[PDB]
């Protein structure tokens, strides 16, 4: 579930190096670059291509 | 790298 419709949703994103899920919210979507801005619980931020990420809602 | 630690 990607695209502009994901904005506003709380998701957990898989970081392979830590073998961990980290919780955040999708704050925006860049249509041209197909990028989501994820703001994490712990203050981290990532600009992500979610289609090549392991991640899940909830 | 993409790690918290």
Author numbering:
A (entry chain A): 602 to 659
B (entry chain P): 1 to 5
Excerpt from the publication:
In plants, RNA-directed DNA methylation (RdDM) is a well-known de novo DNA methylation pathway that involves two plant-specific RNA polymerases, Pol IV and Pol V. In this study, we discovered and characterized an RdDM factor, RDM15. We show that RDM15 contributes to Pol V-dependent downstream siRNA accumulation and interacts with NRPE3B, a subunit specific to Pol V. We also show that the C-terminal tudor domain of RDM15 specifically recognizes the histone 3 lysine 4 monomethylation (H3K4me1) mark. To further investigate how RDM15 functions, we analyzed its protein sequence and found two domains with known functions: an N-terminal ARM repeat, which is known to mediate protein–protein interactions, and a C-terminal Tudor domain, which functions as a histone mark reader. Our biochemical and structural results demonstrated that RDM15 is a reader of H3K4me1, and revealed a hydrogen bonding interaction-based mechanism of recognition of lower methyllsine marks.
The crystal structure of the RDM15 Tudor domain in complex with the H3(1-15) K4me1 peptide was determined using the SAD method and was refined to 1.7 Å resolution. Although a 15-residue H3K4me1 peptide was used in the crystallization, only the H3A1 to H3Q5 segment of the peptide exhibited well-defined electron density and was built into the final model. The Tudor domain of RDM15 exhibits a canonical Tudor domain fold with five β-strands forming a twisted β-barrel structure that resembles the structure of other Tudor domains. The main chain of the H3K4me1 peptide has a ‘U’-shaped conformation such that the N-terminal H3A1 and the C-terminal H3Q5 extend out away from the peptide-protein binding interface. The side chains of H3R2 and H3K4me1 form a pincer-like conformation, thereby anchoring on two adjacent negatively charged surface pockets of the Tudor domain and highlighting a significant structural and chemical complementarity. In detail, the H3R2 inserts its side chain into a negatively charged pocket and forms hydrogen-bonding interactions with Glu647 and Gln654 of RDM15, as well as a salt bridge interaction with Glu647. In general, both H3R2 and H3K4me1 are specifically recognized by a hydrogen-bonding network and electrostatic interactions involving their charged side chains, as well as by an aromatic cage that captures the methylation modification. Mutations of residues of either the aromatic cage or of those involved in hydrogen bonding interactions with the peptide resulted in a significant decrease in the binding affinity, revealing that these residues are critical for the recognition of H3K4me1 by RDM15.
